[PDB]
């Protein structure tokens, strides 16, 4: 199976490796679970916050459309061919693992849209955009947290697997190998002493007797 | 000369086994884990070699079977299976590729159908080099067509459920007495070859 | 990495108009297709929501965040549950005339398994 | 007694436990970073270097009795809050922190 | 007496090696595995000790080298680097503190310039005691600037890339021996020092 | 010289170094996964395989000149920059890269 001479040197450092590594993986799991509890609570809140911010804005948009006397949304879709509010990806280290985050930046491609001129009713549409540009921004910053949360869930599973793996497989494999080789190695040495001794008793006796 | 020896507690380094191994040119193994599931005798390829394997295949090729070509792929399959199994253990079956799943299944089948000589009715019946060759044509065929299929886009599940009957048949083939068309090629083994072909095609598109 | 900077919308008509006033979707210059899907109640197909979801999640890899109304997400539930990646992110936010309901939310289902 | 304090036992406990957590903290830091390190770990990180550089590191002709050892103990410990120092009687502590 | 010692029981905890370590005062290591990658002598800090250090270092201070300072710091880099390496293997790291990468990085240099030497290339193993002092001086200085830069702000990748040209030169300075004058402290190293500080400023801002 | 080059000992050394790492890169994959692996370790993995089945794998009636051996060795060794190769004199490595 394995060497009967000096498996002890490689095996000794493995064994220590394993228990030391295990302790350490537990701290990394503890940190990952530590953050995980916190974000789960923050994310449920953030869902309602986004719901509301969209809804209050969404209703104002509905009101603006019926009061002026025409449906704007068609005209708005046609005018847009750039996305004003864009995002920049960045990695933030939360725990051991890096999560993906988004920081919105506003780029001045377009300011409003070239469709308002609906006389008196047109001021209702211009103002409607002002209220929505602010609402969308709340959603986007909150939306960043959602991304990290999915990323944490994927990592925890790899991490739970490792903590089990070390304890259950590695540590008893090191134990069985080290002890079995130790026991065979000492045996070779002991029998030799007995064989040297056995012939020396024969010698001693022969000398002694006349 | 076929000479049996015994390890001293899983220790193969005991003087008797090492000495006999010194003199031998062929080594055939015996794995404890595999005997517990009932597959004794249990010979793999990382505990066994034969120097005669090279000349022996040349002589079997002549007699009729395609054996040397199938022997090489067969060796590879077992050798990869062991390594792939260590990843299943530690990492899980989530780090695998689809072709590697294929290697795992075909392997499990080989473990049972050759190595096991344990009954279920009757202790297994005389299987020649000719019989043995047919089994190898069906396992090796299963593996090639299935990997092509996954490579070319296809479900794992579709492929394994579909082989189904063919797998039951090879398992139990050895219990049935040799000659069932001929010793050479049995009608029972001949027909599977068609079934794989029909399946491969359904799967692809 | 930084190669994804677009926000796609799956939302009801009035909500998509609003988001677009703020400006987050567009008609791409490399493919000539919106980054928005305009939906109406009882007047558009169940199949079309499916096509849009796939298109932005898997056949587009320049979408950073795909916003989706829970109510609309519900129609095409199999497809929402089945996309499990974080690139792009899939975020269910409360639909119009509905507050937060946890029973329509694909991400919260994933979180349940393990903690 | 009269050449030790009775506070000897209490300090041996405190000194020991914080040095051990610090050994853990070094390994932790390397994986997690400093941009994700815990506030308790930071105190343990500092404790690890000061215990080694004050209590263990000392000159080739320096001499120490239990009173001298004991003064140096309290200056390492001072940095931890009182509520993290709980293996010590409230009596001793309010006098030597 | 400079004595080589070697295994003889096949262990490292065989009597031969036990008696010799006890009687000796100075041990400088060597590892076989690293030696194969070609970096002999591939000194193990942990098995190495010297008793002579204090009197010998006092002597060297009189002779001109500021040696003792560097020595502790040479040992300090190699020690932390060792530990960090087990942590990369064991956990299977997903991040590192920005300082620790520097420690590992500065140790790699130590490996090349000192530890990698070839006794039949005399351009690649020869330095007088002062030349040795200057090369080590340069390293210990690099570590000293690098630790400060992260502290004042700057990313590791910024530190490594902006330092750049002087990092190549120090790496490649192991291909030199006195041959620009009978002088044991060279312009080669003195120039590097001022340029290194200049590099540091860049990294920091 | 004249059928074994000067670069002979140099190239051996390099070939062993990439192989040591390749063997280890297999081992880290088993335990943890692709967690401690990187662009450097991934090259080394490729190296260990290409070397095993091309350099070592030959016939048993194949006569190979010491000139042939060196020519094949260099062809294989193209997998890393010149600056990653410093187990060889920069003079020699330009001539024979």
UniProtKB/Swiss-Prot annotation, chain A:
Task: Spell out the molecular function terms from Gene Ontology.
Answer: proton-transporting ATPase activity, rotational mechanism
* Taxonomy, superkingdom: Eukaryota
Subcellular location as annotated = Vacuole membrane
Q: Write out the GO biological process terms.
A: endosomal lumen acidification; Golgi lumen acidification; proton transmembrane transport; vacuolar acidification
The task this protein performs is described as:
Subunit of the V1 complex of vacuolar(H+)-ATPase (V-ATPase), a multisubunit enzyme composed of a peripheral complex (V1) that hydrolyzes ATP and a membrane integral complex (V0) that translocates protons. V-ATPase is responsible for acidifying and maintaining the pH of intracellular compartments.
Family, per the entry?
Answer: Belongs to the V-ATPase D subunit family.
- Other information: Present with 8500 molecules/cell in log phase SD medium.
Name of the protein: V-type proton ATPase subunit D
First and last residue shown, out of the full length, are: 8 to 217 of 256
Swiss-Prot record, chains B, E:
Which cysteines in this chain are paired by disulphide bridges? none
Q: Which residues form a coiled coil?
A: none
- The chain residues annotated with the modification Phosphoserine are 62
Protein name per its UniProtKB record: V-type proton ATPase catalytic subunit A, 2nd part
Organism in which the protein naturally occurs: Saccharomyces cerevisiae (strain ATCC 204508 / S288c) (Baker's yeast)
> Species lineage, top-down?
Eukaryota, Fungi, Dikarya, Ascomycota, Saccharomycotina
Which part of the full protein does this chain span, and how long is the full protein? Answer: 867 to 1071 of 1071
From Swiss-Prot, chain C:
List S-S links within the chain.
none
Topological type in the membrane: Peripheral membrane protein
MF (Gene Ontology): proton-transporting ATPase activity, rotational mechanism
Matching InterPro entries: ATPase_V1-cplx_f_g_su (IPR008218), ATPase_V1-cplx_fsu_euk (IPR005772), ATPase_V1_fsu_sf (IPR036906)
- Does the UniProt entry include the keyword Transport? yes
State the UniProt keywords alphabetically. Hydrogen ion transport, Ion transport, Membrane, Transport, Vacuole
Which cellular component appears as one GO term in the record?
Answer: fungal-type vacuole membrane
Q: Name one GO biological process term.
A: proton transmembrane transport
Entry superkingdom: Eukaryota
Compartments in which it is found: Vacuole membrane
Q: Which Pfam families match?
A: ATP-synt_F
Gene3D superfamilies in the record, alphabetically? ATPase, V1 complex, subunit F
Name the predominant localization.
membrane
Q: Which PANTHER family match?
A: V-TYPE PROTON ATPASE SUBUNIT F (PTHR13861:SF2), VACUOLAR ATP SYNTHASE SUBUNIT F (PTHR13861)
Function, as annotated, reads: Subunit of the V1 complex of vacuolar(H+)-ATPase (V-ATPase), a multisubunit enzyme composed of a peripheral complex (V1) that hydrolyzes ATP and a membrane integral complex (V0) that translocates protons. V-ATPase is responsible for acidifying and maintaining the pH of intracellular compartments.
Name the family the entry cites. Belongs to the V-ATPase F subunit family.
Assembly and partners are described as:
V-ATPase is a heteromultimeric enzyme composed of a peripheral catalytic V1 complex (components A to H) attached to an integral membrane V0 proton pore complex (components: a, c, c', c'', d, e, f and VOA1).
The entry's other comment says: Present with 4050 molecules/cell in log phase SD medium.
Q: What is this protein called?
A: V-type proton ATPase subunit F
Organism the protein comes from:
Saccharomyces cerevisiae (strain ATCC 204508 / S288c)
Gene coding for it: VMA7
Swiss-Prot record, chains D, F:
SS bond partners: none
> Signal sequence span per UniProt?
none
Q: Where in the cell is it found?
A: Vacuole membrane
Description of how the protein assembles with itself and partners: V-ATPase is a heteromultimeric enzyme composed of a peripheral catalytic V1 complex (components A to H) attached to an integral membrane V0 proton pore complex (components: a, c, c', c'', d, e, f and VOA1). Interacts with RAV1 and RAV2 components of the RAVE complex, which are essential for the stability and assembly of V-ATPase.
Fill in the misc note. Present with 131000 molecules/cell in log phase SD medium.
Sequence similarity: Belongs to the ATPase alpha/beta chains family.
Described purpose of this protein according to its UniProt entry: Non-catalytic subunit of the V1 complex of vacuolar(H+)-ATPase (V-ATPase), a multisubunit enzyme composed of a peripheral complex (V1) that hydrolyzes ATP and a membrane integral complex (V0) that translocates protons. V-ATPase is responsible for acidifying and maintaining the pH of intracellular compartments.
Q: What is this protein called?
A: V-type proton ATPase subunit B
Q: Which organism is it from?
A: Saccharomyces cerevisiae (strain ATCC 204508 / S288c)
Ranked from the top, the taxonomy reads:
Eukaryota, Fungi, Dikarya, Ascomycota, Saccharomycotina
Q: Which gene encodes it?
A: VMA2
Covered residues, full protein: 389 to 485 of 517
């Amino acid at each position: 199976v394995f060497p009967t001479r000096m498996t002890l040197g490689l095996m000794k450092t493995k064994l220590k490796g394993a228990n030391q590594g295990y302790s350490l993986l537990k701290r990394k799991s503890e940190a990952l679970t530590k953050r995980f509890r916190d974000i789960t609570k923050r994310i449920d809140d953030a869902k309602q916050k986004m719901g509301r911010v969209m809804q209050t804005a969404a209703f104002s948009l509905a009101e603006v459309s019926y009061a002026t006397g025409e449906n704007i949304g068609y005209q708005v879709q046609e005018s847009v061919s750039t996305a004003r509010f864009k995002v920049r990806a960045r990695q933030e280290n939360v725990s051991g693992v890096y999560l993906s985050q988004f920081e919105s930046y506003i780029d001045p491609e377009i300011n409003d849209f070239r469709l308002t001129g609906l006389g008196r009713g047109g001021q209702q549409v211009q103002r409607a955009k002002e209220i929505y540009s602010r609402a969308v921004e709340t959603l986007v910053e909150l939306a960043s947290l959602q991304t990290a949360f999915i990323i944490l869930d994927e990592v925890i599973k790899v991490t739970n697997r490792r903590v089990n793996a070390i304890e259950h497989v590695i540590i008893p494999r090191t134990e069985n190998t080290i002890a079995y080789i130790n026991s065979e190695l000492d045996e070779l040495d002991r029998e030799e002493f007995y064989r040297l001794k056995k012939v020396q008793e024969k010698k001693q006796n022969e000398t002694a007797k006349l | 000369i076929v000479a049996a020896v015994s390890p001293a507690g899983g220790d193969f380094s005991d003087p008797v086994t090492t000495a006999t191994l010194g003199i031998t040119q062929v080594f055939w193994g015996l794995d404890k884990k595999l005997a517990q599931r009932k597959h004794f005798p249990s010979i793999n390829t990382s505990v066994s070699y034969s120097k005669y394997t090279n000349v022996l295949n040349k002589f079997y090729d002549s007699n009729y079977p395609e054996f040397p070509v199938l022997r090489d792929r067969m060796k590879e399959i077992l050798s990869n299976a062991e390594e792939l199994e260590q990843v299943v253990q530690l990492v899980g079956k989530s780090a695998l590729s689809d072709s590697d799943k294929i290697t795992l299944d075909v392997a499990t089948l080989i473990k049972e159908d050759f190595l096991q000589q344990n009954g279920y009715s009757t202790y297994d019946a005389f299987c020649p080099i000719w019989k043995t060759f047919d089994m190898m044509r069906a396992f090796i065929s299963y593996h090639d067509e299935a990997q092509k299929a996954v490579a070319n886009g296809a479900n794992w599940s579709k492929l394994a459920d579909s082989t189904g009957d063919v797998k039951h048949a090879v398992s139990s083939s050895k219990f049935f007495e040799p000659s069932r068309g001929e010793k050479e090629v049995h009608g029972e083994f001949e027909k599977l070859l068609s079934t794989m072909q029909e399946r491969f095609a359904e799967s692809t598109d | 990495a930084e190669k994804r900077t677009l926000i796609a919308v799956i939302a009801d008509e009035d909500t998509t108009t609003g988001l677009l006033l703020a400006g987050i979707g567009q008609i791409t210059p490399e493919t000539q297709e919106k980054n928005f899907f305009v939906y109406q109640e009882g007047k558009t197909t169940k199949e079309e929501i499916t096509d849009k979801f796939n298109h932005f999640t898997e056949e587009r890899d320049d979408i950073a965040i795909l916003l989706i109304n829970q109510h609309i997400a519900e129609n095409i539930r199999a497809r929402v549950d089945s996309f499990t990646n974080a690139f792009p992110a899939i975020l269910e936010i409360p639909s119009k005339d509905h507050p937060y309901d946890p029973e329509k939310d694909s991400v919260l289902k994933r979180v349940r398994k393990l903690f | 007694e009269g050449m030790t304090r009775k506070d000897h036992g209490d300090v041996s406990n405190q000194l020991y436990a914080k040095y051990a957590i610090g050994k853990d903290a070094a390994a932790m830091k390397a994986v997690v970073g400093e941009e994700a390190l815990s506030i308790e770990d930071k105190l343990s990180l500092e404790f690890l270097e000061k215990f080694e550089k004050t209590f263990i590191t000392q000159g080739a002709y320096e001499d120490r009795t239990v009173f001298e050892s004991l003064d140096q103990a309290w200056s390492l410990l001072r940095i931890y809050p009182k509520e993290m120092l709980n293996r010590i009687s409230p009596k001793i502590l309010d006098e030597f922190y």
